[PDB]
């Protein structure tokens, strides 16, 4: 049967979109993912990882990427956990090759609940297997993780060419903190790439209010 994996990249940064990645393959060809070594991608330079990405795409029966913008994140009526689960559903419902078994990494949320959330949102019937650290346990989920990370890094590099060197985009990054402070000071607000709801951004805003 056809199986799918889903994972995301960019959950914690203040800069950039949240990327949902989906990978689809026939259970009979999982051997191929093991052979290319999808489980050891994080220990490779984005150079090798890009080559891994390219090999991945030719092997998978199908793959899908969904970019969730910072504006979408900031206007959410629920928590980030609920938001990631609904976007997992959006991407899964867009597949052209539907799977009967779906594996996902539940991250910090209870597995049974995260899985029920996705099963309830799916427009087609399938078994959803949610597990912590599924990205290390299941090849197809590791595959989805690579898709999401490579896609996200590509978008990041593209954004820096337009907005400049803003660091990693994470709140703890000194360069990121300075870039956001300088931007707000020069323009009086933030560009669309910033998640205004992130504490780091919100605080710079307040300080700007004469302080």
From Swiss-Prot:
It catalyses: Endonucleolytic cleavage to 5'-phosphomonoester. GO terms for molecular function: manganese ion binding; RNA binding; RNA-DNA hybrid ribonuclease activity. The keyword DNA repair does not apply. A divalent metal cation binds at residues 7-8, 105. Residues 1-210 form the RNase H type-2 domain. It is found in: Cytoplasm. Its EC number is 3.1.26.4. Keywords: Cytoplasm, Endonuclease, Hydrolase, Manganese, Metal-binding, Nuclease. Pfam families: RNase_HII. The keyword 4Fe-4S does not apply. Manganese or magnesium. Binds 1 divalent metal ion per monomer in the absence of substrate. May bind a second metal ion after substrate binding. Its main location: cytoplasm. Its cofactor is Mn(2+); Mg(2+). GO terms for cellular component: cytoplasm; ribonuclease H2 complex. One of its GO terms (biological process) is mismatch repair. Belongs to the RNase HII family. Endonuclease that specifically degrades the RNA of RNA-DNA hybrids. This is Ribonuclease HII. The gene is rnhB.
């Amino acid at each position: 049967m056809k199986v799918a994996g889903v994972d995301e990249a960019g959950r914690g940064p203040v800069i950039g979109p949240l990327v949902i990645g989906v990978a689809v393959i026939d259970e009979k060809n999982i051997e191929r993912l093991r052979d290319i070594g999808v489980k050891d991608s994080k220990q490779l330079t984005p150079g090798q990882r890009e080559k891994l990405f390219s090999k991945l795409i030719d092997i998978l029966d199908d793959y899908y990427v969904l970019l969730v913008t910072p504006k979408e994140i900031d206007e959410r009526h629920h928590s980030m956990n609920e938001l990631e689960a609904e976007k997992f559903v959006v991407a899964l419902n867009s597949l052209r090759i539907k799977p009967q078994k779906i594996y996902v990494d539940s991250a910090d949320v209870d597995p049974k609940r995260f899985a029920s959330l996705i099963k309830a949102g799916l427009k087609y019937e399938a078994t959803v297997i949610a597990e912590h650290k599924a990205d290390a346990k299941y090849e197809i989920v590791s595959a989805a993780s690579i898709i999401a990370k490579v896609t996200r890094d590509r978008e990041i590099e593209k954004l820096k060419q337009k907005y400049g060197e803003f660091g990693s985009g994470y709140p703890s990054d000194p360069r990121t903190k300075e870039w956001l402070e300088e931007y707000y000071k020069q323009y009086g607000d933030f560009p669309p790439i910033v998640r205004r709801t992130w504490e780091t951004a919100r605080k710079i805003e307040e300080r700007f209010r004469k302080n």
